[PDB]
């Protein structure tokens, strides 16, 4: 034995795209069985399966965001540059539980607050200050987990001062439709969330940097690498390869346009030449 490598995956677009990603350039690169463990739920289940490993019911592989690993896993302040929170989760994983943080993918995934490119034109919106001016005027409607915990709405609201008239607590899609209707102004979003551009939503700018930096990288079990030291190379082949604007693209076609997320993560693949046409 000893050919397999699991990667993981919660139940959410990105992440089951760049999962697919991951076990693509394993395939395509390696003589590696992949087994692809896209289902995996709960409190950080990804980590807690990493530390199990493939060999013990878990996962030896999947891909994470510098600032959950920062402030969620290991509990330091969330106001820091990006290189900065890349090089303490890289340390600290891998002194407390040897894991390597690999390169980062390129796109930071950060929580954000989006308004209508119109309104936003209006208004002449840039920024999460800029809102916070005009927010006596604006309702907000925004998802139930972003509105709970001093993470989310409580404590953005009390660093800028947003006075919205109403906060609508909405889940499902139901903020999509209620921007769209003008019932709400503003909406919580990820700012690779694939329905952005579609529904003509700007993103703004988090002025106080009130949210951590937010970008992904694969992280992999050492034991891992040293069975296959390959992998570190080919892993890093998706260095600096995804921008914003192209995970943004990606979940749209899942999100948007009900593509396979394998199909889109392997067409993806072969059109940045990061895989062979034939592979």
Do not use: C
């Amino acid at each position: 034995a000893n050919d397999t490598v699991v990667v993981g995956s919660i139940i959410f677009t990105e992440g089951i795209i760049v999962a697919n990603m991951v076990a693509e350039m394993i395939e395509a690169h390696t003589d590696l069985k992949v087994v692809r463990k896209l289902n995996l739920g709960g409190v950080n289940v990804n980590f807690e399966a990493i530390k199990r490993g493939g060999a013990n019911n878990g996962i030896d592989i999947y891909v994470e965001y510098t600032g959950h690993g920062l402030v969620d896993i290991l509990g330091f302040p969330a106001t820091t540059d990006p290189e900065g929170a890349y090089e303490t989760v890289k340390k600290e994983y891998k002194r407390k539980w040897n894991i390597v943080w690999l390169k980062p993918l390129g796109f930071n995934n950060t929580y954000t607050l989006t308004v209508k490119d119109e309104l936003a034109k209006q208004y002449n919106l840039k920024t999460f200050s800029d809102l916070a001016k005009i927010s006596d005027k604006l309702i907000l409607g925004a998802t139930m987990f972003f509105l709970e915990g001093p993470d989310g709405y409580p404590g953005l609201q009390k660093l800028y001062n947003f006075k919205f008239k109403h906060t609508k607590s909405m889940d499902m899609g139901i903020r999509y439709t209620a921007i769209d209707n003008n019932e709400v102004q503003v909406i919580d979003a990820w700012a690779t969330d694939g329905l952005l551009v579609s529904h003509k939503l700007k993103i703004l700018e988090d002025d106080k940097a009130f949210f951590p930096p937010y970008y992904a990288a694969p992280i992999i079990r050492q034991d891992v690498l040293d069975k296959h030291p390959e992998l570190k190379d080919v892993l890093n082949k998706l260095a600096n390869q995804i921008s914003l604007e192209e995970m943004q693209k990606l979940n749209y076609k899942v999100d948007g346009e009900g593509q396979d997320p394998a199909k889109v993560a392997k067409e993806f693949l072969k059109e940045k030449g990061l895989i062979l046409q034939v592979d």
